[PDB]
Design a binder for this molecule. Structure first.
Ligand code: HEM
Ligand code: SRO
Ligand code: MG
Length: 453
């Protein structure tokens, strides 16, 4: 076919379509209107947005397509360097670091991070137990406090002490502002305007704040010789089985900045959406709370108890199906190739997988795609290959997936064990877009079940 394309803006082509606070949500509406594929042009560039399982299962063939770094990740590369997320597959440091790090991210490795994840989860539950009668919880704010502190603790045994603050640790402040600079740089008139030189000055300082802290922690760890249960230990001790080389100190720094920058926000938004869906769906909240109570029988949850929260696991997947918090990923064609038997591609052509649309493909999931039904995930095996990709694809898939889901299942499990929730404001979903998705303004009241930690 000749591909559908959304409205244009003279020489700017489709570009001003992404000049909005909600670009992915804009793209979903365009996908609904145009179908499983549309072209998108900007000055100097072109990509094609894929929304069907039919086409995306082809895009996910690693023999034909590789990971593309799109403009946002290209700018995040300014501070995360050749860390795993912002490396190209063909860069030596990508495969090196992937080989070294994969065993530290396995489901088995979650046993060793568990105690540290509990440490922060306990701080979350204690915070809520200590709220007064007419106070409420700011959900994405508390989730992001928890996930930042959890990754800091497991990543490099550093305590950001986010539950002790209204203004985050200076590293967090600089990171979130660096992520913001990378995102705002996408929408800029003439990016070289002298009104942005402050933004530039600020970005360079934020990079410095981040490298100085992480470089110093690596330095102190090497000097102390201490062996902890964190990823920094694993990285200073590890050797690539392939090259036989260890990561160098710079690369280790970039990995740590990556884990923090890439991991915190999608995990925090997953938890937020999942609590949003349960408060809007009381029969499913009861099924999840009933499991938490039947399963988490000890003052603090064990790793094996977390693995047993099946229904919580299914809630988390259904939240990821509706609102995958890292909503898109980009590929390039390794060679000329014909997509779907219909769309000829040239070597280097880019594709964008629009994950929220994939997950609403009625031919896969049925007609009820907007409904929240954890039971869709009751059996792992019934879901067709490439139909559910909130963690992307293949060897460039999320190395943090077992970590995110262990973290999310543990904390959602404890939250449902410890409190009844009330959607006291009848909150209207408002999805804010940064690098990730979250429900902005989502607030609840919790009433303690008065169960000891
Ligand atoms: C629910 C939470 C998460 C979601 C939805 C998510 C999603 C994703 C997706 C879609 C990608 C592929 C990006 C691409 O193709 O360009 C990815 C890659 C990656 N993720 Fe996650 N992620 C999450 C949590 C985490 C956490 C907790 C960590 C680390 C602690 C993490 C670390 C990374 C890294 C390093 C990569 C790059 C992997 C590579 O290419 O070798 N993520 N993630
Ligand atoms: N681990 C995921 C880092 C991340 C944050 N936001 C995202 C948006 C798209 C994507 O492919 C990836 C991301
Ligand atoms: Mg229902």
């Amino acid at each position: 076919k000749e591909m559908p394309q959304p409205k244009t803006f003279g020489e700017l082509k489709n570009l001003p379509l992404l000049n909005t606070d909600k670009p992915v949500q804009a793209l979903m509406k365009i996908a609904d209107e145009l179908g499983e594929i549309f072209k998108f042009e900007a000055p100097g560039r072109v990509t094609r947005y894929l929304s069907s399982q039919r086409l995306i299962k082809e895009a996910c063939d690693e023999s034909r397509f590789d990971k593309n770094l799109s403009q946002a990740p290209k700018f995040v590369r300014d501070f995360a360097g050749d860390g795993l997320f912002t490396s190209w597959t063909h860069e030596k440091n990508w495969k090196k670091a992937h080989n070294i790090l994969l065993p530290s991210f396995s489901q088995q490795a979650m046993k060793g991070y568990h105690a540290m994840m509990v440490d922060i989860a306990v701080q979350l539950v204690q915070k809520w137990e200590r709220l007064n009668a007419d106070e409420h919880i700011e959900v994405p704010e508390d989730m992001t406090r928890l996930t930042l502190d959890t990754i800091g603790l497991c990543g490099f045994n550093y305590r950001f002490n986010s539950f002790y603050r209204d203004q985050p640790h200076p590293f967090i402040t600089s990171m979130v502002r660096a992520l913001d600079e990378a995102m705002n740089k996408l929408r800029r008139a003439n990016p070289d305007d002298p009104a942005y030189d402050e933004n530039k000055r600020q970005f360079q300082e934020d990079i410095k704040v981040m490298n100085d802290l992480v470089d110093k922690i690596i330095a102190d760890r090497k000097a102390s010789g201490e062996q902890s249960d964190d990823l920094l230990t694993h990285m200073l001790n590890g050797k690539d089985p392939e090259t036989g080389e260890p990561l160098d100190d710079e690369n280790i720094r970039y990995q740590i900045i990556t884990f923090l920058a890439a991991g915190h926000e999608a995990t925090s938004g997953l938890l937020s959406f999942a609590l949003y869906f349960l408060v809007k769906n009381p029969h499913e909240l009861q099924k999840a709370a009933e499991e938490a109570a039947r399963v988490l029988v000890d003052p603090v949850p064990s790793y094996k108890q977390v693995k047993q929260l099946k229904y919580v696991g299914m809630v988390l997947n259904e939240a990821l199906r509706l609102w995958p918090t890292a909503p898109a990923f980009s590929l390039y064609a390794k060679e000329d190739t014909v997509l779907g038997g219909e769309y000829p591609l040239e070597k280097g052509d880019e594709l964008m997988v629009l994950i929220p649309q994939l997950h609403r493909d009625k031919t896969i999931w049925g007609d009820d795609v907007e409904e929240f039904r954890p039971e869709r995930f009751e059996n792992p095996s019934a879901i067709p290959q490439h139909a559910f990709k909130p963690f992307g694809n293949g060897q460039r898939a999320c190395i943090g997936q077992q970590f995110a889901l262990h973290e999310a299942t543990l904390v959602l499990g404890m939250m449902l064990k410890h409190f009844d929730f009330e959607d006291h404001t009848n909150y209207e979903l408002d999805i804010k877009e940064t690098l990730t998705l979250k429900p902005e303004g989502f607030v609840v009241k919790a009433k303690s079940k008065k169960i000891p930690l």
